[PDB]
Nucleic acid binder design. Sequence first.
DNA 1: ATTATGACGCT
DNA 2: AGCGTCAT
Length: 430
Amino acid sequence: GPHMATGQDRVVALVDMDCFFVQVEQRQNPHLRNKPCAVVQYKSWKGGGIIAVSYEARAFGVTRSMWADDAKKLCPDLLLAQVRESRGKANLTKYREASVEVMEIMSRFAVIERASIDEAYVDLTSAVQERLQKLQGQPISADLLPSTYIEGLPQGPTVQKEGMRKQGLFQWLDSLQIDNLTSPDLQLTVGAVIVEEMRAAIERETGFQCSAGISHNKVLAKLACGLNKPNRQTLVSHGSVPQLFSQMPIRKIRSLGGKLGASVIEILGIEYMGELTQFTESQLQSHFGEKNGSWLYAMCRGIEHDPVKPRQLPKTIGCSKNFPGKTALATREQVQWWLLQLAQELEERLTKDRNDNDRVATQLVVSIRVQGDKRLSSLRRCCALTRYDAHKMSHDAFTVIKNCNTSGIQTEWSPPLTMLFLCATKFSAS
DNA sequence: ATTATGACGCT
DNA sequence: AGCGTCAT
Ligand SMILES: Nc1nc2c(ncn2[C@H]2C[C@H](O)[C@@H](COP(=O)(O)NP(=O)(O)OP(=O)(O)O)O2)c(=O)[nH]1
Ligand SMILES: [Mg+2]
Ligand SMILES: [Mg+2]
């Protein structure tokens, strides 16, 4: 009753750039704008692998992970942009720099947590309180929410999508109690006003469009963001959770799309997030552990406590390359040469990071995959990173991995390597 | 022959 | 420390 916490204490948004790498290439090359187009890495094998797809191309069935030649079967007029190649590998610098453009704009409004190259959580609680004091009990006009959907509305007592959006928004705004400065629904609404402003600033100052979710925690904000894409934002209220979760497959919630979510489905014999409410917290803990069980018990009621961490910059800087099938590295000279290529890219990125961000990495992690292993990493070894020098980093990476070589011969490498991965970690202020 | 990352949990 | 999970 009155002591049951409802998880309505914060206003959290999740901003995700629409088809990011595509938008970056479309800004640079206007010929690609408003066209079916995709971004690929490499070219020789089946036209390259697609990693980003414009919404026009998605309409033809083009997806991430698809080979470009196969996508062209679905969409013969598909336009392609390729990721830059440097030192024999994909170089994603253009997209990292575009990411910084967007994250620096978002940081003007609130503290953000960089979740990926194109997404960030925003903790809007304090900004909402400030705006509410400015409003002085003034109602919120639908004009302030021109791209907002209210999940679950309209309901009750109409043909086109924009008319649906506006009907639901008007139902929502009509029911708002703007008298109460601590009303969670009001707070979410003001949060959505601020996110309209943030998204407008991003588009004005970069050209990039994005979608967003606004709710009371990170998981609901992330889920909300996906409900109306592209170039729209969605508000998920605490009250909308029972209906939303009643038909929501468990795998759609962040962290449940893998083995744990499958085990929830299999062990409990359920399909939808809402069905989890019928288990006690101890029952869920008995199946999935203390932490997961408590998290599931609260999350299926719309409640989650994970904070938006104050972190705009990535925690690691890494370089990796796969060597599939017949291109696997089978000689010592080969392994050394590719370690050097990776190390030279890493040195470039690390030196720029030190100048930009007043920090230095202190640990180098070396990960490899060997032929036949189905895992992502076959072996992971760390050493000290004491100087931003590519020849030194590559020699040290070789030194920590050289004992994996089964070959009695000094020149040969067996079993050949299907992936090399260098990662700079454990940053310190400088 | 999906690739290139990045965050984080467990022991 | 080194390995596994989730994501995309
Ligand atoms: N190198 C690499 N980059 C990837 C991969 N997957 C995604 N990216 C890059 C390319 C993506 O542009 C970017 C952001 O990833 P999303 O938010 O998951 N997809 P997007 O923003 O394209 O579409 P949406 O409108 O549905 O959000 O990350 C990958 O496997 N490898
Ligand atoms: Mg995106
Ligand atoms: Mg994203």
